[PDB]
Amino acid sequence: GPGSEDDDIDLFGSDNEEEDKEAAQLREERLRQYAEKKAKKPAL
Secondary structure (H helix, E strand, O other), X not given: OOOOOOOOOOOOOOOOOOOHHHHHHHHHHHHXXXXXXXXXXXXX
């Protein structure tokens, strides 16, 4: 509950390091998509 959270809670990145999961995942999984298919399809 806010009121005395002050700066504990960041609006867009609450902790953010907890989201290391998607920091890494989105980063890595989306590069897979790009690497595989864009090395076979001509750019598009």
